[PDB]
Amino acid sequence: KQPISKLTRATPGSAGLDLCSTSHTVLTPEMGPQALSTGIYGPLPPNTFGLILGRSSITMKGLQVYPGVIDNDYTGEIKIMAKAVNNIVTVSQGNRIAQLILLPLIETDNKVQ
Amino acid sequence: KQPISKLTRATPGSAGLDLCSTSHTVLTPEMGPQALSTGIYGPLPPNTFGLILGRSSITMKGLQVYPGVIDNDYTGEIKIMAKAVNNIVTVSQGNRIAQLILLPLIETDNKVQ
Amino acid sequence: KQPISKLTRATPGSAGLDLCSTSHTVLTPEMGPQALSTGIYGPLPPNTFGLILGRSSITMKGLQVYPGVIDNDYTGEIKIMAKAVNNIVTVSQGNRIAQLILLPLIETDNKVQ
Numbered sequence: 001k002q003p004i005s006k007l008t009r010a011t012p013g014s015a016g017l018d019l020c021s022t023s024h025t026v027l028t029p030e031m032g033p034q035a036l037s038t039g040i041y042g043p044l045p046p047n048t049f050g051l052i053l054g055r056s057s058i059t060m061k062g063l064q065v066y067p068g069v070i071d072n073d074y075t076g077e078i079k080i081m082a083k084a085v086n087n088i089v090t091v092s093q094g095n096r097i098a099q100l101i102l103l104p105l106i107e108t109d110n111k112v113q
Numbered sequence: 114k115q116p117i118s119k120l121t122r123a124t125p126g127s128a129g130l131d132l133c134s135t136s137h138t139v140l141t142p143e144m145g146p147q148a149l150s151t152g153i154y155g156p157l158p159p160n161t162f163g164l165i166l167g168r169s170s171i172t173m174k175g176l177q178v179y180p181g182v183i184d185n186d187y188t189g190e191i192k193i194m195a196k197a198v199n200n201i202v203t204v205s206q207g208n209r210i211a212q213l214i215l216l217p218l219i220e221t222d223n224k225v226q
Numbered sequence: 227k228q229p230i231s232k233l234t235r236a237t238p239g240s241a242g243l244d245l246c247s248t249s250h251t252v253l254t255p256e257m258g259p260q261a262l263s264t265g266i267y268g269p270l271p272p273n274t275f276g277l278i279l280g281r282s283s284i285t286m287k288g289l290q291v292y293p294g295v296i297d298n299d300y301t302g303e304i305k306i307m308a309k310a311v312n313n314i315v316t317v318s319q320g321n322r323i324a325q326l327i328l329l330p331l332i333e334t335d336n337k338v339q
């Protein structure tokens with residue numbers, strides 16, 4: 001397992017930490033949403049949570065990443081939820097296909113289910 | 114009307130406050146975007162705004178939630194904008210179909226329209 | 227070029243800064259993702275980054291905006307990544323078709339690629 005500290009930024013001013021595919025994946029529109037493995041695991045820094053979003057270059061090439069929330073204390077594998085929009089898309093292993101953005105976790109008095 | 118204080122978290126560390134359907138809704142891809150009623154109303158805590166996002170389990174079952182912004186002082190009903198991706202989707206009344214995340218509202222000098 | 231200080235809010239409590247189309251654009255579903263020009267340029271205020279999101283009224287009329295990240299130090303043109311969902315959509319020049327939300331940029335020790 002690899003932790004989020006292993007992710008890299010494109011540039012010092014990049015908001016997102018890039019996430020790569022651990023497998024070669026081919027997606028077609030009729031497949032619908034697929035969960036792609038990253039080999040990167042939570043949890044996140046104290047008092048933060050995450051959002052998974054598409055990289056703009058990847059979105060423009062027709063692979064939609066559905067926004068995902070990563071809880072502060074999630075310790076499982078971060079997966080990228082993705083769909084080929086209207087053409088066949090091919091994801092080569094190790095290609096950066098999404099990004100993790102970190103956001104402050106606001107506390108409230110809402111109850112637990 | 115019910116306020117956001119009535120929403121619950123799945124777990125103490127969950128970033129999102131879950132939102133449920135007040136009606137049974139069936140969606141087909143050819144319907145396009147539909148606004149689903151939640152019976153939950155703004156406004157949000159001081160100095161915060163909201164984002165509405167899909168739950169990952171729901172996204173994976175083919176119901177796309179389009180990200181929505183909830184203004185700090187919105188006092189209307191929070192609706193979930195949703196679309197069946199490529200199969201028929203059925204939403205039973207009371208099923209959790211989206212989540213509200215709270216974020217800090219940054220002040221700027223931008224003018225009002 | 228116009229900076230983000232030129233954008234307006236719908237109301238004092240609106241979370242997003244609205245973004246308009248500089249061109250008339252017609253989109254069909256088979257076109258897939260298109261990058262629409264706004265004539266608005268980064269960079270963003272110190273210690274912030276941006277998210278580009280759809281306006282709810284626009285989403286409901288069948289134009290999907292794919293969420294986009296705007297880095298703090300991006301100095302290029304902010305483009306709106308958009309797709310017609312399942313009908314033909316027409317965007318008249320100057321119509322507000324997305325919004326920019328500003329978020330705190332969290333610093334980490336992650337390395338640069």
Ligand SMILES: O=c1ccn([C@H]2C[C@H](O)[C@@H](COP(=O)(O)NP(=O)(O)OP(=O)(O)O)O2)c(=O)[nH]1
Nearest residue numbers: 052068069070071074078079081123168169170
């Ligand atoms: O894109 C994503 C979204 C979520 N996740 C993981 C991390 C997150 O903390 C966890 C739960 O996310 P959601 O609350 O969106 N899913 P859901 O509500 O269906 O599951 P749960 O009931 O456990 O909260 O799923 C991903 O790995 N990728």
Ligand SMILES: O=c1ccn([C@H]2C[C@H](O)[C@@H](COP(=O)(O)NP(=O)(O)OP(=O)(O)O)O2)c(=O)[nH]1
Nearest residue numbers: 165181182183184187191192194236281282283
């Ligand atoms: O998913 C959503 C998105 C928005 N909303 C409500 C809350 C928000 O404050 C309000 C306005 O959101 P937008 O600014 O995204 N919509 P739009 O720009 O079309 O309307 P307005 O001109 O009033 O700002 O709509 C929802 O209930 N669900």
Ligand SMILES: O=c1ccn([C@H]2C[C@H](O)[C@@H](COP(=O)(O)NP(=O)(O)OP(=O)(O)O)O2)c(=O)[nH]1
Nearest residue numbers: 010055056057278294295296297300304305307
């Ligand atoms: O909707 C968007 C998304 C991004 N952008 C611009 C601003 C942002 O700082 C820049 C890079 O965004 P991403 O990191 O999402 N794209 P990508 O990873 O493909 O390019 P790079 O490798 O340069 O980071 O693209 C837009 O103008 N509109």
Ligand SMILES: [Mg+2]
Nearest residue numbers: 010014016055
């Ligand atoms: Mg990038």
Ligand SMILES: [Mg+2]
Nearest residue numbers: 123127129168
């Ligand atoms: Mg959940």
Ligand SMILES: [Mg+2]
Nearest residue numbers: 236240242281
């Ligand atoms: Mg608005």
